[PDB]
Structure 1
Amino acid sequence: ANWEHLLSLKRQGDTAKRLRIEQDDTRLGFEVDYDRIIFSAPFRSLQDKTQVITDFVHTRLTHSLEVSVVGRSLGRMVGKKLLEKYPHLEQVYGYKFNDFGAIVAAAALAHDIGNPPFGHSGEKAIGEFFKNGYGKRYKDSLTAKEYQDLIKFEGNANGFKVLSQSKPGAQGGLRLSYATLGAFMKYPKESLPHKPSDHIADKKYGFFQSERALFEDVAQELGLLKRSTTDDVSWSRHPLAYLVEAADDICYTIIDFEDGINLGLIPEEYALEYMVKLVGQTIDRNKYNALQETSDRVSYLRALAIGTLINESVDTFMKYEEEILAGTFDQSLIDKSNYQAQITDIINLSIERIYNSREVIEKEIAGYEILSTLLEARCRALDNNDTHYNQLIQQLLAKSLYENLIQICAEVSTMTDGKALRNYKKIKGL
């Protein structure tokens, strides 16, 4: 692989090359990608989409924003070092350090844009509907990969669909730069085979069969290395996808901890105990001791721990840069961290006190009923579109059979929590 091609400014449908040296610096394709996501309806809808805890103040919008800020910093710091290592990228092709930050920031901003409501439970409810619920009746009319898309419905792949879906008058969706789409693709494989190895890039899949042809275009414009030895297609990650992943991992690990503490689920005394190693060399104890509010103290620790992990991730990336470029790096960047023990203790505490708290369990149980109900109504109307009731369902909630089912899943998944519950209540009469 080669950074000239990995940094492609191509947009869908382009007939001519886009030279980096010919970009208007006030209209740089990578920075335009950020703005197009910010102003898109799917991104705006994240305001009414909650994280694990429903407080009105912990939204999927804020997490996506904070992940993108951490990603911009990671891309900027790695970008400067890549241009020192590969100076022809600047001198000949015209690339600049902010370009790497723009790519990572845009891809990070949109990482959760396709996830269904209710978190991983939402994904499992959609899958269970097609594995064992009403939807399993379609198994014999779909390819193995088409059915695997449904029974293992993946929010990551739905995000790729959302970013690129074509509609009359809007071919290419948001038409993001191919480098940004490459940085977005954490799992560059189709739904089959399922988990062929223990590599992180193979734990899940990144595109539906409906988007296979699109990512094939992306994968070769970027010059990504083929990996699979079969008709089952798979590529090794765009190097910048490692930075998108590190930003999410850092923010999920540290900010969930901060949230659990501010919400009262995690006792405040655990903050210093679990983060002292991550913040020791940079913390100002007199500043810390002078802070009077709990929230101000843990946010201070949060900023210090994120700064530490950002710098360490940048160094880890450059240490393994050639292995990543060759598709031989077998781990995430955070897996190589010197703070793995502290990171694991933090994650396990968040699992026990937040993700397995009674309120979250209750929300996930209700999410199953809500999604299963919306999925059954749309699928029954698809099967019998002639009855008066199914026509009403058609107007309220809303090609080949597979295209209709994957579209139904994508639409149910991008519904706000408020719209999913409201439509659920009408289907039930409340």
Structure 2
Amino acid sequence: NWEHLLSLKRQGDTAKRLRIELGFEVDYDRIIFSAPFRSLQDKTQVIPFVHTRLTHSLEVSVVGRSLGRMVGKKLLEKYPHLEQVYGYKFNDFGAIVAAAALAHDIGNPPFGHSGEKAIGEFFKNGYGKRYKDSLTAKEYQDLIKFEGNANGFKVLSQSKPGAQGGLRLSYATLGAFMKYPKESLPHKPSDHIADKKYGFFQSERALFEDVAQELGLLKRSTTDDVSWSRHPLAYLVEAADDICYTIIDFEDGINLGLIPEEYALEYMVKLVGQTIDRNKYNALQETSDRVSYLRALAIGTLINESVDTFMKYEEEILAGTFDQSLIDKSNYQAQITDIINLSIERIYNSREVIEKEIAGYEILSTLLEARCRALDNNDTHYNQLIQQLLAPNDHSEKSLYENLIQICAEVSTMTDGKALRNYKKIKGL
């Protein structure tokens, strides 16, 4: 039911909010001005001009806003009652998808997936193994299979003294942000696209249950482990992100010298052939302009194809029977796969990227060990100094799992500069 999916409800609301009577734009406005989003300006994208996480978020938001606007147009033309009595507009869908896409990278720890694996391995085989017997199975699982999507949900909606609900985003935006509406256990029960990872920690189970019950998400789990169907706009958000990750990593790889210019045309002829102006392409004198020209065309065709695919399986998506992505139903699957493989071989496996990941591991391991050692023995002078350096903000009487997840969130959201400086101080440099 689309009426419940486009909920304007926020945390702490008592009276129901109706479309015909704050707005989805306000979510984007709040995310833009938020400190965690601003902090993305000092966070890199694990590549050797090259995009930072802030620009990637910006570009993803721009693709998601286009996808959502077109999808809202088509749904409003398919469900007249959504605008006749409920008063919804395609700009609403665009705003929801743009706000969800803008914050999709707000909780990811530095150094890419290597940082997530470092946080996981710290609690699996490192100093964090001591907490295994003091936590429940799902809590420990969250600790060992730490992902930045659950951390991003935590950042977007975590209460603090004087700020309940965090950014207080609308429930539609929160639902679109959740790509994996399931708990930390069981680990990958099936081949469904939404079961690859989890989207919320144990400290957010009640809040996401409230969000799902407000959005009317279908309960797909018959056991005691909660799991819901994906929000239909989460498909658009993820498709936008994949389109950017594919076409823009290739642009960045080509412009940085890691990928020769021939592969650009070689893997973009199929994508851009239907709309390329050959005279304009040949008239361009710089490689950067040509690759930008190709990137714009490819993004446009992929956006249109994703909109067509979404409207092809709307009923299946709303029922929860869709087990793959919108980009997986692409006619350009071979070219997309070839581009992704070439990017993996030339960028992600480059020395510079490997070197950086090896440093992240040592920095994150050191910081996590220092924070945990301070947590266990908060009486020594060195531990008091560590607490002052890394957690001067506040202190409270919380549980062990809350403290550990707070440590993980604080370490994940540090800027590369702040993390490196703290690691050097702790290492006496």
Q: Distance in 1 between matches of 2:125 and 2:369?
A: 12
The residue number in structure 2 matching 1:309 is 302
Q: 2:232 aligns to what SS in structure 1?
A: coil
Deviations 1:198-247 (A, max 9, x none): 11100000000011111000000000000012111100000000000000
Deviations 1:278-308 (A, max 9, x none): 0001000000000000000000000000000
Deviations 1:15-67 (A, max 9, x none): 01001001xxxxx52100001000000000000000021xx742000000000
Deviations 1:385-423 (A, max 9, x none): 000000000010000000000000000000011111010
Q: 1:329 aligns with which of 312, 318, 322?
A: 322
**Aligned-residue offset at 1:372:** 0.2
Q: 1:214 aligns with which of 194, 200, 207?
A: 207
Deviations 1:81-128 (A, max 9, x none): 000111101001110010000000000000000000000000000000
Q: Distance in 2 between matches of 1:58 and 1:280?
A: 27
The residue number in structure 1 matching 2:244 is 251
Q: Distance in 1 between matches of 2:415 and 2:193?
A: 29
Q: Distance in 2 between matches of 1:402 and 1:297?
A: 52
The reply on whether 1:19 has 2:13 as its aligned counterpart is no
**Aligned-residue offset at 1:311:** 0.2
Q: Is the CA contact 2:181–2:230 (under 8 Å) kept in the aligned structure 1?
A: yes
Give TM-score scaled by structure 2 length.
0.98
How large is the RMSD of aligned CA atoms in angstroms? 0.6
**Aligned-residue offset at 1:362:** 0.3
Deviations 1:66-85 (A, max 9, x none): 00000000000000000011
The residue number in structure 2 matching 1:86 is 79
Q: Distance in 1 between matches of 2:371 and 2:79?
A: 53
Q: Distance in 2 between matches of 1:6 and 1:58?
A: 33
Q: Is the CA contact 2:50–2:252 (under 8 Å) kept in the aligned structure 1?
A: no
Q: 1:50 aligns with which of 40, 44, 50?
A: 44
**Aligned-residue offset at 1:143:** 0.5
Of 56-65 and 201-210, the range deviating more from structure 2: 56-65
Q: 2:20 aligns to what SS in structure 1?
A: helix
Q: Distance in 2 between matches of 1:29 and 1:394?
A: 40
Q: 1:180 aligns with which of 173, 180, 185?
A: 173
**Aligned-residue offset at 1:252:** 0.1
Q: Distance in 2 between matches of 1:91 and 1:50?
A: 45
The residue number in structure 2 matching 1:234 is 227
Q: Distance in 2 between matches of 1:90 and 1:173?
A: 31
Q: 1:8 aligns to what SS in structure 2?
A: coil
**Aligned-residue offset at 1:326:** 0.3
Q: Which runs of 5+ in 1 are unaligned?
A: 23-27
Q: 1:68 aligns with which of 37, 53, 61?
A: 61
Q: 1:29 aligns to what SS in structure 2?
A: coil
Q: Distance in 2 between matches of 1:192 and 1:423?
A: 34
Deviations 1:156-199 (A, max 9, x none): 10000000000000000000000000000000001000000111
The alignment covers a number of residue pairs equal to: 422
The reply on whether 1:364 has 2:353 as its aligned counterpart is no
The residue number in structure 2 matching 1:25 is none
Q: 1:115 aligns to what SS in structure 2?
A: coil
The reply on whether 1:263 has 2:256 as its aligned counterpart is yes
Q: Distance in 2 between matches of 1:235 and 1:29?
A: 25
The reply on whether 1:146 has 2:139 as its aligned counterpart is yes
Q: Distance in 2 between matches of 1:343 and 1:59?
A: 23
Q: Distance in 1 between matches of 2:227 and 2:246?
A: 29
Q: 2:166 aligns to what SS in structure 1?
A: coil
Q: 2:169 aligns to what SS in structure 1?
A: coil
Give TM-score scaled by structure 1 length.
0.98
**Aligned-residue offset at 1:330:** 1.1
Q: Distance in 2 between matches of 1:230 and 1:406?
A: 25
Q: Distance in 2 between matches of 1:278 and 1:218?
A: 38
Q: Distance in 2 between matches of 1:139 and 1:263?
A: 44
The residue number in structure 1 matching 2:427 is 428
Q: Distance in 2 between matches of 1:306 and 1:231?
A: 42
Q: Distance in 1 between matches of 2:109 and 2:115?
A: 6
Deviations 1:288-342 (A, max 9, x none): 0000000000000000000000000000000100000000011100000000000
Q: 1:269 aligns to what SS in structure 2?
A: helix
Q: 2:290 aligns to what SS in structure 1?
A: helix
Q: 1:21 aligns to what SS in structure 2?
A: coil
Q: Distance in 1 between matches of 2:163 and 2:328?
A: 40
Q: 2:276 aligns to what SS in structure 1?
A: coil
Deviations 1:246-291 (A, max 9, x none): 0000000000000000000001111000010000010000000000
Q: 1:153 aligns to what SS in structure 2?
A: coil
Q: 2:404 aligns to what SS in structure 1?
A: helix
User: Post-superposition, which runs of at least 4 consecutive aligned residues in structure 1 deviate over 3 A?
Assistant: none
The reply on whether 1:38 has 2:32 as its aligned counterpart is yes
Q: Which runs of 5+ in 2 are unaligned?
A: 392-397
Q: 2:218 aligns to what SS in structure 1?
A: coil
Q: Is the CA contact 2:60–2:241 (under 8 Å) kept in the aligned structure 1?
A: yes
The residue number in structure 1 matching 2:407 is 408
